[PDB]
């Protein structure tokens, strides 16, 4: 499947994933597209911040769906 990660600029980076793709692995694909380490992304979906240990299905994110890149600001 694919999903549309809208950057906070609004550059929608489409990427191919699986409903069982973990956020850790999705963020690694984002790092491949955007150049931001996964540990430093704050991935958002519909206002829900996702966590590394979870999956697209854990948030009921399916194909042809839209995500958001936000920064962690590595606050701690």
């Amino acid at each position: 499947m694919q999903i549309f990660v809208k950057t906070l600029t609004g550059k929608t980076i489409t990427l191919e994933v699986e409903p069982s793709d973990t956020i850790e692995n999705v963020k690694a694909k984002i790092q491949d597209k955007e150049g931001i380490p996964p540990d430093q992304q704050r991935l958002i979906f519909a206002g829900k911040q996702l966590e590394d240990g979870r999956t697209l299905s854990d948030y009921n994110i399916q194909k042809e769906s839209t995500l958001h890149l936000v920064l962690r600001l590595r606050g701690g």
Partner: protein, 45 residues
Amino acid sequence: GHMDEKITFPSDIDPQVFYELAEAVQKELLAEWKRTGSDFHIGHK
């Protein structure tokens, strides 16, 4: 002093998605971006 605060919107983060995403996330983030003062390095490039 001068330029004690410097929220910036690079080729990776722009106000429009910020206005369009969940308002509660925008408020939380805006507090992040202004408490650091210069948002550290939004876009991280």
